[PDB]
Amino acid sequence: VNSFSGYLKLTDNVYIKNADIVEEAKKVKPTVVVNAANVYLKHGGGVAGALNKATNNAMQVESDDYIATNGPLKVGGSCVLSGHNLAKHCLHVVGPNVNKGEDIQLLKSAYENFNQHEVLLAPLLSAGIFGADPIHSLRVCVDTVRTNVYLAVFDKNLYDKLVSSFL
Numbered sequence: 296v297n298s299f300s301g302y303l304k305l306t307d308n309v310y311i312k313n314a315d316i317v318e319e320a321k322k323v324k325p326t327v328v329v330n331a332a333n334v335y336l337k338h339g340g341g342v343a344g345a346l347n348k349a350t351n352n353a354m355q356v357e358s359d360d361y362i363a364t365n366g367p368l369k370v371g372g373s374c375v376l377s378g379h380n381l382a383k384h385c386l387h388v389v390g391p392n393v394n395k396g397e398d399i400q401l402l403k404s405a406y407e408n409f410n411q412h413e414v415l416l417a418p419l420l421s422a423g424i425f426g427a428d429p430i431h432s433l434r435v436c437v438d439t440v441r442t443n444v445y446l447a448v449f450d451k452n453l454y455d456k457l458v459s460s461f462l
């Protein structure tokens with residue numbers, strides 16, 4: 296039993312809700328919240344910008360120190376940093392950004408990072424301004440992640456489309 300509430304059940308291990316991931320993280324205070332990161336951990340826009348704003352820029356400060364020490368991530372890769380006021384930990388996962396010309400095939404590798412954590416609150420990787428079809432992101436998710444994932448979908452109309460077309 297966990298403190299997630301109001302999710303539709305897609306599969307044995309994947310649940311989905313029409314919710315703002317920022318407000319959901321503040322309410323649940325999950326163990327792990329997933330960020331839609333880029334390799335530089337530059338959290339300017341999208342989910343990354345929104346999560347970072349909710350931490351009062353503490354996420355960016357921590358991230359810049361991480362990059363200065365370790366260099367960039369790989370597309371498909373991840374790192375675990377603090378969750379600040381939103382969660383215990385933030386798993387920064389780099390899905391491919393189609394709008395940058397990155398290989399959509401790396402989406403499965405990106406989702407594999409989720410399997411290192413028993414329970415996660417997450418957005419649809421590579422969707423939004425990363426340019427991949429959210430329907431495809433949900434499919435790769437369900438077919439890759441074996442741990443318990445709670446997906447927050449921001450847009451109501453997209454949420455409706457994702458559920459009704461899910462096989």
Ligand SMILES: O=C(O)[C@H](c1ccccc1)n1sc2ccccc2c1=O
Pocket residue numbers: 331341342418419420421422423424429447448449450451453
């Ligand atoms: O609603 C959501 O959660 C997702 C989403 C996933 C990751 C980051 C930001 C947004 N949306 S809304 C939306 C509106 C127009 C076109 C695409 C999307 C889309 O993919």
